C-alpha cells in the first residue's frame, strides 16, 4: 500500500521497481505537500484498441495543487513515479508494453503540416496512437525497448512501475508547453478474455506521482 | 555462399565519438555569375542529409564542437577569386544581399580564403543556450496557441547561420561557383538513445512519415 | 630560419583527418554540462538493450500483428534465420539497425520468447538451434536431436536461449548464411472454457557483451 | 568492400558520411592515404586453394578469397 | 514567446581585452587602373566605422598594440601584382604620388606581398607620445586663439598613416583593386569608462549630434 | 630537412585568430605606463555602476 | 608565429620516401595477428633453402 | 548602462538592484507599494494584486 504525502494507493509490487536509466529522481533560490499520487481516469482496453499515451507535465497541468503551482510558477523540475495497473481475472490474456519515451515528437501520417497544440496537448484525458506499430514517431514498436520499458503480462505480471528522473538538457524547464516524458501503454497482443464478451472492458488505471518537485517564481 | 571467420577485436570502432564525429557533406549549393544576389546562406542543422539525420536521431541529447570545412569549386562557361565565409550566430540580422553592411561587422567571425588555397575550416564551439542539442522536442517555441508557432522546434537548438560571399563576384567570365560544406562533430557526448527510424522523410521542420510499407517494414516472406 | 619541407599529401583535404583547427571564438566558454541521465559511450552498449522481432513477417500480417505469432488448436510454429542483413525477423531489431551500419560483425546473442496466453492455459514447445550450414529442421525428430529446450507455459512465462557467437559479412555478391532457430508444437494448447483458444508468442533479441562491430559503412535503409 | 560503387560521376555515393575521401587539386602535391590492414582474414593470401561460394556452379570463381578484397578507389 | 533557461558561466567573454581586441574592417577603399594617382592613403583611427567607434568611445583612456591586416582584391573588366604597404609614422612627409621618393626610404617600415599570397599583417606597438590613447580630449592642438587650431584633437593621439602602393600599377588589363584593412587591438588596458553614445555621427573630427529623437531616445509608449 | 604538411584551413585569414605577428619595430620600447585612475578589467564591472 | 622555410626539394614526390601519412581510418583496429607458421624476415633466409 | 552593455550580448542572465529616490520636500510625507511580478504572471492592475 504505497503512499506519498496525504493520498495512498494499494499496489501489487512483486519485483524491483526499476528506475529509468538507474537514476533515482532528485532536485538540484528555487525550492510542498503536492507530492501525492494522482490516479487518472480508467481506460477501456478493448480487443480492437491501438494504444494510449499521457504527456506527464501536460497530464498534471490541471490536477490539484501540482496544477495550481504549475499555473502560478513560471518554471518546474520534477521526477515522476508512474504506476500502471491492468485489472483482469485469471481467465483474460494479453500483454501491455509500458514505454516512457523521452521527447516523443508526435508525427501525423500522410500530411505535410505538423501536429497542432490540440492533437499533442490532450492533458489528463491522454492520447491514442493512430499507428501503434510506428509509435507516431517514424520509429518501430519493435525498436521501442531502448526507452525505459516494462511488461504487464496478464499471466504473472499484472502491474508495472516506472521511475523517471529529470530528463532535460536544462536544470529546469516549462510545464505549460514542454513534455519531457511520454508514458505510452500499448497492447502488443490483443485482449482475448473469451468469456462471451460478458465484460470486454478490462480497464487500465494510471497513477502519476511528481517526486522531488521544485519551482521558480511565486 | 560466404567465407567469414572474424576474429575478436576491440571496441574502438563502435565508439559514439567515432560514429557521429567525422566529416559529412551536408550542403552542395551552386551559384551562377553572369552579366546583387546568389550569395550563400545556410542554416546549421544535421537534418539536411537523410543518412547523417538518422545517425544523429539515434540519440535524444548530444553535445559536440562543430568543425565546418568549406570547399570551393569554380565551373567556367581558373581565376583565384576571394571567398569570405561569415559565421553569424543566432539573433543577428542575416546579410540582406551580397553588398550588405552585415559583412563589414566587428562582431561576426569570418574567414578569408581563395580557390587555389586549401579548403577553409572553422571550429564553432558548443553554441546552444540549452546544455545539450535535442534532436526531438515535445514542446513549442512560443506561448501563443496559434499555427504561427511551429511544433517541435527548440529555438535554443539553432547553431546559427553560415554565409559565404564571393568578393570577386563581378568578373569578366560567366561561370558557376559551387560551395561544399562538411560538418564534423568533436567531443560528442550522447544521452537517451532513440528507436532507429525506418520510414523516409518529408521536411527538416517536421517528422511526418509518408511510406517497405507503413503497415509492414520488412519485405514480407 | 628553421627549415621545413612540404611532404606529398600536403595541401590536401582528408575527409577523416583529426586536428585542432583555429577557434572561431578564442576565449568563449560553452554552457557548463550537468548529469543528463542515460549516458552512452558506445553502440555496443545499445545492442545490449533487447529489442522485439517480427517473427510473423507474412504478407497477411499488417502493423503490430507482425510482432506476434499465433498458437492454438503438433505442427511447426515458426522459423527464424540468424542473418541480420537477409531482411528476416532480425532486420527491425536494434541489433539489425545498428549492425547494418557495420560491414564486419561477430558475437553471441540472447533470444527471449515471452508467452501472452492466460494464467490457466498450459502447453509445451520445443525450441531448437541449428548451427550454420545445417538444413533447418522440418520434423520434431530433427528438433529433438539438435541443441533444444522444452519451453513450458505452465511453469515459466518467458524463456531465454543463448545463441553462441556467430559471424557474417556482405563483401560479385553472394550474400551470406548463418544457423536457424525453430519452434515445434510439442503438445496441444490446453485452455479451459473461460480463456480464448487463440494465444500469441512475442520475440525479443539482444547481443551479449561478446558482440563486436568493426568496419563502418552507410546503411541502405534510407 | 561491401559498399555500392559510384554508378556515375554525379552519384549519391560521393555525398556519403561513411566513405573516406581526399580533396586536392592539380598544382597541389600528389594525394596520399594509408589504408590499414583491411581484410577479414588475419593475412592476405596471394594463392587460395578454395572457392568464394558453396554452389557447385561455374558462377562461383576458383581461387578467389572474398576476404582478400582491399576495397575500391574511385577518383572524380 | 521565449524559451530561455541560461545556466551560470565564467567572465571570460565579458573581458575588455576580448571586447575591443579583435579584427574589424575599418577601410574598404577601391582604386581604378586604366589607360600617377589612385595610391592608398589611410589615417589610423578607430573613428571611421560607427560600431567600433562607439565600442572604443565606451572608455576614456586605453592602450593597445595594433595588428593591421591588409587583404588585397582584384576586379578585372587573375595576375599576381606586387603590393607594398608602408607604415609612415607621424611627422614624416606622406607619399606625394605613387612614383614618390618616400617609398624608397631607409626609415619607414613596409611589407611586400602579392594577391595570391596570404593577406599581409603588421603589429604597430603602442605608438603615441601620451602614455594612453584619449578617445575624447577637452583641449586644443595649438596655442593660437584661431579657428585654424581644431577643438578636441590631441596631436599625440595620431597612430601614423598606412600607404599601400600597387607596384605593378601599369598592366595590360583595365581593372579595380580594393584594399581591405582589418584593425585588431592587443593587450588592451582601459581607464575611466564613458557614458555610451545614443545619437548618430556627422564627422570623425567632431562629436556633433544631429538626431529616436534628440528630445527622446527610446520610442515613446 | 624536417618534414611539414599544410593542413586544410592553412593559407586562410580567420578574422578572430590570435598569433604573434612579425613586429614592425623590432627593438622599439613603447612609452612606459603609469597608474591611470579608474582601472576596469571587464564590462561586468561596468554594469555594477 | 613560428618561422619556417620551404627548402628546395619541397613540394616533390620522392617515390622511395618513408613518412607517416594521415590515417584514412583514425581509430580503426586491424584484425589481430596470430602465429602463422614459416616466418621469414629476409630473402637471405630464402636462398638458405 | 545595463541595457546599452547587454545589447552587445545575445545571451545574458543575472540579478538586479533597483533604487527609487524621492525628490520631494523634507516636510512632505506619503506611502507607495512597490511590487515585483515574476515572469509569466500578468502585471498587477489594483492594490489587492
Residue numbers in the entry:
A (entry chain B): 15 to 42, 52 to 54, 58 to 244
B (entry chain A), E (entry chain A): 49 to 83, 92 to 133, 143 to 276, 282 to 291
C (entry chain C): 1 to 73, 78 to 175, 183 to 233
D (entry chain A): 155 to 230
F (entry chain C), G (entry chain C): 1 to 49
H (entry chain C): 98 to 146
What do the authors report?
Enterovirus 70 (EV70) is a human pathogen belonging to the family Picornaviridae. EV70 is transmitted by eye secretions and causes acute hemorrhagic conjunctivitis, a serious eye disease. The capsid of EV70 is composed of the subunits VP1, VP2, VP3, and VP4. The major capsid proteins of EV70 are organized with pseudo-T=3 icosahedral symmetry, with VP1 subunits forming pentamers around 5-fold symmetry axes and VP2 and VP3 subunits forming heterohexamers at 3-fold axes of the capsid.
